[PDB]
């Protein structure tokens, strides 16, 4: 019921180097939101290169200055922070490590002391922390798991506990939420399946019923939300559609509605898209409707891998793909 | 960030920031470790409660003041800072920052007044029922005190009463009931109590999907089919005609037409082979969004179907 209602003029077309010219001059106009959002840098840095990359235009990004500031953003204990300063945590651990995945740059950073960071952050009951401080979530459980995958260090960790702890995350609907009790979400259901594809463990997840799901998550408008009785968003078109596709139910979203929204949300005078159709633009639903687009099947973009959110080419090179259903 | 519509004071606002932020880094490489940096943050975190480093730097300061401090002085800190928690959370309560600094905080008081964390809990529930931060802090909060899964069950009730938006009461539920239970899905007594609340719900209100989700659990949660006691057997035959009375009046409510065919299933896949085809078909015409799952679910039903006919002796 709570839906957009998608305007007659709203873009029917992919603007694609419209976005390649958005992304290579973001956070070049002292900008407001820029500054503001410096304590996410290191993803922002990870969603414009990876959009960059989807769309053949990564070349026009930084390389030698993107990898300097890598290196500096990692501390003596082997965690990398969102920006210089700033403290060390699995989410921009992970971030740096697809960055440099992206740029086969591995060696940048101290790999040996990454992965005894990620280590470290495990806990008895197998979940993991976001950092020091002790957050639990399953996107850290994901973030951990993907890191060691992209440096071939999973065996690392304790996977057995790791996956015991995401089981016991599973929902009577078939999702996950963010701790044992937590109620289900797109987000955490990305995290989740993402976990189990990387450790070998889709066939505990119940695919109809996970599936059937995530696809009633699809409104009238053709956009997906995140949760039952909630507005459409853009990103969603990313975090549904890759669990979709990594228990092999692709096909229960109407493929077409889902494009005709992507679309409506991109921002034809700037480039970029937004959230919903008429909002602001930003780099993070970028990614995402680019993403969720090449998923969908669009030409003009490499296809993208849904357990990593990067261009497949880059995980065949490193040799990490994991099985999905 | 999200729902930002289609400039001097920002300029201002900005360059304070920036100030503020630069002096709490300075002030950390050095070694300054007090209530200043507090003051700072404070002036931050307000408007970005995302900026992670900074509820680090205020857990140090905390942290460091509680030696070089006297217990009364560092009692009047954390009330201060759970009054700071506090008007954080008014003005932005879906930030997972906000909400962990109060779980740190409240895990190394001796001792917390539990029974006003709850009832915080109960407020900002009112505001957004569906906030699952706070839901999340919730259950924390009943672990902590060990308030009992009845207790809770109480409270659930209360809220899928009074309005909708249920979909994260029903969630709670589902969890508390296995545990009130306990086992080593649902007992049959448990679960018909649970079919006439959840079956009251989507009779006052058809739109209400949350109703739907849960009520397809519970036809899964039984002992299942062909050990139907009378009793269940009425129940869901009961339930199958209260549905068919209400596609009547909602025709295009696609909730019960599947709700329908489930309940079928539960009763007799073969019996009903032939309504739950035409159910099928009226349904895709409802919501043809669906109809990819919708021929995979009956794919399956129908090989599920195969399989019962050739048991046959
Ligand atoms: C809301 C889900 C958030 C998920 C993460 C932070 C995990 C990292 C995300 C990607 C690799 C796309
Ligand atoms: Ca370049
Ligand atoms: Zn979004």
């Given at each position: 019921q709570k839906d957009v209602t998608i305007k007659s003029d709203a873009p029917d077309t992919l603007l694609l180097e419209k976005h390649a010219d958005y992304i290579a001059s973001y956070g070049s106009k002292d900008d407001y939101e820029y500054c503001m959002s410096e304590y996410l840098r290191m993803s922002g840095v990870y969603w414009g290169l990876?959009?960059?990359?989807?769309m053949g235009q990564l070349h026009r990004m930084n390389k030698e200055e993107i990898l300097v500031f890598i290196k500096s953003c990692q501390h003596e204990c082997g965690g990398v922070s969102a920006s210089i300063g700033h403290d060390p945590h699995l989410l921009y651990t992970l971030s740096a490590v697809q960055i440099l995945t992206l740029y086969d740059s591995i060696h940048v950073i101290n790999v040996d002391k990454v992965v005894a960071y990620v280590q470290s952050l495990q806990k008895e009951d197998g979940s993991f922390a976001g950092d020091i401080?002790?957050?639990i979530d399953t996107r850290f459980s994901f973030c951990a798991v993907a890191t060691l995958a992209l440096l071939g260090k999973l065996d690392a960790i304790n996977v057995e506990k790791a996956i015991e702890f995401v089981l016991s995350c599973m929902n009577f609907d078939g999702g996950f939420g963010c701790r044992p009790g937590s109620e289900s979400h797109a987000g955490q259901i990305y995290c989740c399946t993402g976990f189990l594809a990387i450790t070998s463990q889709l066939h505990q997840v119940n695919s109809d019923l996970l599936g059937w799901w995530l696809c009633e998550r699809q409104l009238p408008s053709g956009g997906l939300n995140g949760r039952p009785e909630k507005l459409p968003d853009v990103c969603?078109?990313?975090?549904?559609?890759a669990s979709l596709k990594?228990?092999?139910r692709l096909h229960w979203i109407d493929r077409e509605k889902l494009r005709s929204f992507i679309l409506a949300?991109?921002?034809?005078?700037?480039?970029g898209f937004a959230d919903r159709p008429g909002d602001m633009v930003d780099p993070f639903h970028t990614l995402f409707g680019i993403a969720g687009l090449s998923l969908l099947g669009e030409e003009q973009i490499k296809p993208v891998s849904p357990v990593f959110c990067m261009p497949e080419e880059v995980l065949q090179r490193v040799n990490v793909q994991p099985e999905l259903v | 960030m999200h729902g930002r519509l289609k400039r001097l004071e920002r300029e201002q606002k900005l360059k304070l920031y920036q100030s503020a932020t630069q002096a709490v880094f300075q002030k950390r490489q050095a070694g300054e470790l007090d209530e200043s940096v507090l003051e700072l943050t404070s002036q931050i975190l307000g408007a970005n409660p995302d900026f992670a480093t900074l509820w680090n730097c205020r857990r140090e300061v905390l942290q460091h003041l509680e030696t070089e401090k006297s217990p009364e002085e560092s009692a009047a800190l954390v009330k201060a800072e759970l009054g700071f928690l506090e008007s954080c959370l008014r003005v932005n309560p879906k930030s997972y920052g906000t909400w962990?600094?109060?779980?740190?905080?409240?895990?190394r008081l001796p001792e917390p007044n539990w029974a006003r964390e709850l009832e915080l809990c109960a407020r900002f529930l009112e505001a957004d029922e569906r906030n699952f931060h706070c839901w999340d802090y919730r259950r924390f909060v009943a672990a902590q005190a060990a308030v009992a899964p009845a207790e809770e069950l109480a409270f659930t009730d209360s809220l899928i009463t009074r309005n909708f938006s249920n979909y994260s009461s029903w969630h709670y539920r589902s969890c508390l009931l296995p545990q009130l239970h306990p086992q080593p899905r649902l007992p049959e007594n448990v679960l018909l109590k649970e079919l006439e609340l959840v079956q009251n719900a989507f009779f006052t209100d058809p739109?209400?999907?949350?109703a739907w989700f849960y009520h397809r659990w519970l036809l899964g949660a039984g002992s299942g089919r062909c050990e139907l006691s009378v009793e269940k057997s009425t129940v869901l035959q009961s339930e199958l005609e209260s549905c068919k009375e209400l596609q009547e009046l909602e025709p295009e409510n696609k909730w019960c037409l599947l709700t329908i065919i489930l309940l079928m299933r539960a009763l007799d896949p073969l019996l009903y082979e032939k309504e739950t085809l035409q159910y099928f078909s009226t349904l895709k015409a409802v919501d043809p969004m669906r109809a990819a799952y919708l021929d995979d679910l009956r794919s399956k039903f129908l090989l599920e179907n195969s399989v019962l006919k050739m048991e046959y002796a």
């Open positions: 990876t959009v960059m990359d989807l401080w002790g957050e969603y078109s990313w975090w549904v559609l990594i228990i092999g949300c991109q921002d034809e005078e700037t480039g | 962990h600094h109060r779980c740190w905080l409240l895990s739109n209400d999907q949350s």
